[PDB]
Chain A
Amino acid sequence: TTYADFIASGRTGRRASIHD
């Protein structure tokens, strides 16, 4: 399931905002 794919992903935590 996609949800499961999400969970095992590396971006499950707090996402930092980008700049340049």
Chain B
Amino acid sequence: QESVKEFLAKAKEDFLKKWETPSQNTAQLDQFDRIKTLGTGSFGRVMLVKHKESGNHYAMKILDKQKVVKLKQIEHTLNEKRILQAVNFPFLVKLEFSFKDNSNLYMVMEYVAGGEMFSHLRRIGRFSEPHARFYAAQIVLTFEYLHSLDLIYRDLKPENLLIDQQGYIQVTDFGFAKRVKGRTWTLCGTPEYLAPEIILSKGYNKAVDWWALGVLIYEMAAGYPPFFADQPIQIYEKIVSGKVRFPSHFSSDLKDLLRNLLQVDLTKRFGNLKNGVNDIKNHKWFATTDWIAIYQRKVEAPFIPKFKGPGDTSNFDDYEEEEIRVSINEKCGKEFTEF
């Protein structure tokens, strides 16, 4: 318990060195080959790429300067990159390279071939409590680290957790990540995962991440989220309402834990109490979990997705291949000066 505190301490120091003095233009477009698109986003897409000098595969994130701009996501894009190049945690996707060009922003990360948890979750339906618990444990720890650096993640969902070769998770998409001492007020996240304080425009803190966990956990063990409907509006209504129904297969410990994460009253919510994280690590639901073991990647994973070979894309869905178009004249230069 003190070992943790001390860990965190050195870790904050490392982060700060990088937070105050970031990396810029460490690669070029040409140094890679575009293999396949792995996902599409709002302002960009993700592609499997291949580094010519080393023959290593990576996932390259590509953001359109112009769309980031019209969508007023400028600050958010700067944050994502600035933060990603500074963290280092076993369950965080590693940023290798970063660069930009006349029309785009690029973030090159390592490739995690197991695909999104979302695909498995959906295909299988739901996970057994022990299975989900395995995952939760990793996110608790990840949040423990992140929150320590005065960071809020803000975009927890199955779509964002990737599964590696060992069956361990990797958190991707820091598009909403923000370093903040104090409150923030941006309306952002994914409907089914938004805390009421966000929805209510109340000004929020890192406690929103904990409500998110609650949702994650419920979703994985039930196979469906606690609050769903066909139009966001309908969802917002159920979130703030305060009602939550659980499946009859939930263990009582589970129901207890989720009843605490899904606390509308920020003043009662687990994780945002004096004792923070400990209120969670100590719960009966996780009585079996050896935090240290998880951290160390010593625990045997419930499911390992088998990799056919390096560069294999079998675990991702297919998307139409647009082609990377690179302008002759620079787009939004001053806006992305620090990238």
- A1 shortest CB reach to chain B, Å: 10
CB pair A18 B228 closer than 8 Å: no
B97, CB-defined interface residue at 8 Å: no
CA distance A13 to B258 in the complex (A): 24
CB pair B189 A11 closer than 8 Å: no
- A16 shortest CB reach to chain B, Å: 6
CB pair A2 B189 closer than 8 Å: no
- B127 shortest CB reach to chain A, Å: 14
- B192 shortest CB reach to chain A, Å: 7
CA distance A11 to B42 in the complex (A): 17
CB pair B72 A15 closer than 8 Å: no
CA distance A9 to B159 in the complex (A): 18
Kindly list chain A residues whose C-beta atoms are within 8 Å of the C-beta of B190.
Answer: 15-18
CA distance A19 to B157 in the complex (A): 16
Give the contact-size bracket for chain B.
20 to 34
CA distance A19 to B194 in the complex (A): 12
Q: Which of A3, A10, A15, A19 contacts B192 (CB 8 A)?
A: A15
Main secondary structure of the interface of B (DSSP, over half): loop
CB pair B176 A17 closer than 8 Å: yes
Q: Which of B76, B186, B228, B245 contacts A11 (CB 8 A)?
A: B228
B73, CB-defined interface residue at 8 Å: yes
CB pair A9 B187 closer than 8 Å: no
CB pair B188 A15 closer than 8 Å: no
CB pair B42 A20 closer than 8 Å: no
User: With A15-B191, A19-B188, A20-B72 in contact, is A10–B159 under 8 Å at CB?
Assistant: no
Main secondary structure of the interface of A (DSSP, over half): loop
CB closest chain-B residue, reference A19: B188
User: With A3-B223, A12-B122 in contact, is A17–B228 under 8 Å at CB?
Assistant: no
CA distance A16 to B229 in the complex (A): 15
User: With A10-B230, A11-B230 in contact, is A2–B224 under 8 Å at CB?
Assistant: yes
CB pair A19 B159 closer than 8 Å: no
Q: Which of B122, B187, B232 contacts A19 (CB 8 A)?
A: B187
Q: Which of B76, B118, B222 contacts A14 (CB 8 A)?
A: B118
Kindly list chain A residues whose C-beta atoms are within 8 Å of the C-beta of B159.
Answer: 14-15
CA distance A11 to B230 in the complex (A): 6
Kindly list chain A residues whose C-beta atoms are within 8 Å of the C-beta of B71.
Answer: 19
- For window 50-107 of B, CB contacts with A under 8 Å fall at 71-73, 76
CA distance A16 to B71 in the complex (A): 14
B115, CB-defined interface residue at 8 Å: no
CB pair A18 B118 closer than 8 Å: no
Kindly list chain A residues whose C-beta atoms are within 8 Å of the C-beta of B155.
Answer: 17
CA distance A16 to B175 in the complex (A): 12
User: Hey, what's the 0/1 contact readout for B208-238 against A, CB within 8 Å counting as 1?
Assistant: 0000000000000011100011111000000
- A9 shortest CB reach to chain B, Å: 6
Interface residue ranges, B against A (CB under 8 Å) = 42, 71-73, 76, 118, 122, 125, 155, 157, 159, 175-176, 186-192, 222-224, 228-232, 245, 247
